[PDB]
Amino acid sequence: SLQLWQFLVALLDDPSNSHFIAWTGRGMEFKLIEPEEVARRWGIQKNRPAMNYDKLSRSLRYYYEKGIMQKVAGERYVYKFVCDPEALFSMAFPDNQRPLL
Structure with missing residues (x-):
């Protein structure tokens, strides 16, 4: 499974994409430099x-x-x-939020 937030992180991780999407350098802030190009991808x-x-x-x-x-x-x-305990759980478990036996 791949959802949008993960896709954005994949693009952001590669700095050669900086001309359309980039980590701004302020913590976990990012900018869609070319919003329609992000959408096209x-x-x-x-x-x-x-x-x-x-x-x-x-x-x-x-x-x-x-x-x-x-x-x-x-x-x-x-x-x-967002870097908070609750958001981390949601990001850790995109597909199953009762992951334990």
Whole structure:
């Protein structure tokens, strides 16, 4: 399984992608430098050729409403991953949140 937050982290980990998505250097903050290019790549990844940023952005909002990300104030395309105990559990268990016997 691959969901959007993981996909973004995969792109962010490779600094050769910095011209369209980058860790800003402020903690866990990242910027979508070319939002439609990020969306295009997500569409390729998921075989959804009609993917676009409008669609992708819904997931960003779902993540910040759930406290997995935060939207940075004053910015359009700057977000941060949340580093807290509860968010770490959600990120550790994307597919099963009753993982123990």
